[PDB]
């Protein structure tokens, strides 16, 4: 099985803002899958 | 064996930029030069910081370049004065068509389609003598001269037309440098040994006996065959001479030469040599080359070997 995340959490508050992702059903380890990932497992930015 | 055979990379060095030259009116620029302290070679970092600079600049004199009146020669719309004979020529001697654009019945266009001499525009390129490569299109070697003179390559060939920049061309077939060199090295070894041995010994009543023996045979070899073949052929299918006088310069060359400032500028007149090259072919072998090096190595090794050994040790006792 090849991995992909759930939908990412929309944002946290302003003054520094964060988005987060999980693979709970999706994950490779069941029946010995392939790559889990293609980008950043967590994400954050300035508000402006 | 060799490794890093290719020699140590010289990285480029350039001097400090000079002054901004006396500001050139007609180009409306001033040029800042720099020189080379060592070129790049064997793969070193190029002169990647660009080798020349131009600054936009206010003039400080009028431009003094003339217009050409050219004594009844025909001024084409891009400014070339072609020969008066070519007015209403037919074909197109200006490139611009200005020679023919509005006319009555033209002068005689040739009695047929004729192809030009093969690769003939190479005879009209320039050569950068410092860099060992072509530059420019110095002559328009598709200029027809308003005439239908022709050369035949073979009975099987179509006829070919001579552009007016060439004093003569010959078709031939030649080999003019011819080289075949070949080497063979062959080496064989055959080695072997084979052997046998035997022996036996002997010595209440008590008695003892012994026997032993051996055998071997072996054969081995190495072989090498390595062979080389270099063939270099220089073949000279065309030979040519470009005229001594009145050569027809290419549109794109005749443009740049007019554009150059009348007052000197090192960078502006220098780009003519990057663009058009340093020298042109007055005569030359429009030929073919084949160069071929075939190197071969073959090497081989073999073995066979056999052995046996035996021993026996016996005793009797009685009373």
């Amino acid at each position: 099985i090849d991995g992909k995340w759930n939908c990412w959490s929309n944002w946290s508050s302003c003054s520094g803002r964060r988005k987060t992702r999980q693979r709970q059903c999706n994950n490779p380890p069941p029946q010995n899958g392939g790559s889990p990932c293609s980008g950043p497992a967590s994400e954050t930015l300035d508000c402006s | 064996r060799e490794c890093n055979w290719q020699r140590c990379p010289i990285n480029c060095l350039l001097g400090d930029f000079g002054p901004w030259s006396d500001c050139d009116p007609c180009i409306e620029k001033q040029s800042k030069v720099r020189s080379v302290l060592r070129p790049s070679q064997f793969g070193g970092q190029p002169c990647t910081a660009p080798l020349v600079a131009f600054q936009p600049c206010i003039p400080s004199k009028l431009c003094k370049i003339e217009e050409a009146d050219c004594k009844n020669k025909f001024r084409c719309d891009s400014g070339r004065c072609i020969a008066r004979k070519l007015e209403c020529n037919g074909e197109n001697d200006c490139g611009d068509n200005s020679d023919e654009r509005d006319c009555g019945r033209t002068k005689a266009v040739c009695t047929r389609k004729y192809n030009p001499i093969p690769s003939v525009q190479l005879m009209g390129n320039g050569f950068h003598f410092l860099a060992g490569e072509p530059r420019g299109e110095v002559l328009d070697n598709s200029f027809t001269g308003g005439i239908c003179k022709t050369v035949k390559s073979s009975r099987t060939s179509n006829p070919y037309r001579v552009p007016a920049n060439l004093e003569n061309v010959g078709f031939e077939v030649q080999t003019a440098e011819d080289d075949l060199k070949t080497d063979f090295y062959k080496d064989l070894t055959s080695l072997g040994h084979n052997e046998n041995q035997q022996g036996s010994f002997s010595s209440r009543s008590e008695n003892i006996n012994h026997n032993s023996a051996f055998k071997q045979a072996i054969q081995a070899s190495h072989k090498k065959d390595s062979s080389f073949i270099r063939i270099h052929k220089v073949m000279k299918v065309l030979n040519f001479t470009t005229k001594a006088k009145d050569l027809h310069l290419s549109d794109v060359f005749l443009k740049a030469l007019n554009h150059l400032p009348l007052e000197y500028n090192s960078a502006l007149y220098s780009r003519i040599f990057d663009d058009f090259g340093t020298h042109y072919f007055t005569s030359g072998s429009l030929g073919g080359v084949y160069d071929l090096l075939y190197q071969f190595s073959s090497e081989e090794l073999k073995n066979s070997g056999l052995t046996e050994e035996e021993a026996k040790h016996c005793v009797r006792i009685e009373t």
């Binding site: - | 410092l130 080389f228 020298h279 030929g287 160069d291």
Partner: protein
Amino acid sequence: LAWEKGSSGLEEKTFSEWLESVKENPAVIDFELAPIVDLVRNIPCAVTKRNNLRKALQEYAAKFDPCQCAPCPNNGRPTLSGTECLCVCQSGTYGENCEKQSPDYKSNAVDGQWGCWSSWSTCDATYKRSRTRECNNPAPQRGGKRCEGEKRQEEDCTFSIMENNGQPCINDDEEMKEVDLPEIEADSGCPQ
């Protein structure tokens, strides 16, 4: 023909079909050169732009003469694009700048080639400057051979005399006009 591996030596079928195709599109294999700046006759200010263009070729050579390249391996001629040197190779030498040899070519070792001129030695006591070059790219050591073309130059110590003030426009045909017809003369006045 270029695809042919060559183990047989030349396959005359392919070599002849290629050679017939060479009649149909050649390449320049050897050549005899005249300098670009001799050509030009059409342009306005021809003579002036010509003078300047010789003069630029002198400076261009002083800057880009491949004598300044490090010694070429295996007796190639050094050649310089402007920003990199590459060596032009001899038959039996190859690689990017001639670093390696066919097994026959190793026998030559003749090795006769120049390094750059020194700057000008100032006037020789008959007012002529001069300069010399020293055969000093990788020297004629194991074999022996002269570098080609005269080792030294002599050049009159010429310099400028007058306030520079730009340049005049000059064209080849004009100067021999000892006589020309009386002008349209609209400022009527009188002739002599």
